[model samples]
Target: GKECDCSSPENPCCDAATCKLRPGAQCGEGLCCEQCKFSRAGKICRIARGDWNDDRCTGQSADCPRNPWNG
Candidate 1:
């Protein structure tokens, strides 16, 4: 079973507002996490949806889609 999956209850640290991982967690637990840290500007964080709308990781934030397309 390859150990576990995020969708399952193995690593249920999905909630940021109230997520607690043994009282030693931080804010770098989001989907945007890249090696426990976010960096590398102009990198593709979100793939194209075929609608021609994709996203990338920017220096301003750890998430993707730093382009004109919000959706």
Candidate 2:
């Protein structure tokens, strides 16, 4: 999969400073793909977790919930 732009306002940028493990949360490359985070929920997810294609929980990968820092 392609990497998230992290430049556009659409995609939430993930870096070494933020992101921590949370059960059932997606936090990785495509997880931060180019997509608008306009809603309150979206912003929360962006800061708390990362990003995703669809519903954060439903479309998440089994490898998720791992430490983004370790990746």
Largest lDDT belongs to which candidate?
A: 1
What lDDT tens digits, residue by residue, belong to model 2 across residues 2-69? 34323333323333223332222244334332232222223222223345332332233322233334
In lDDT terms, how accurate is model 2? 0.31
lDDT tens digits, residue span 1-71, model 1: 42221233434443333333323332244345554355566767777755665665674454554456554
Give the number of colliding residue pairs in candidate 1. Answer: 2
lDDT of 1: 0.47
Looking at candidate 1, what is the lDDT of residue 25?
Answer: 31
The clash numbers for all candidates, in the given order, read 2, 1
**After TM-score superposition, what is the CA distance of residue 41 in candidate 2 from its true location, in Å?**
20
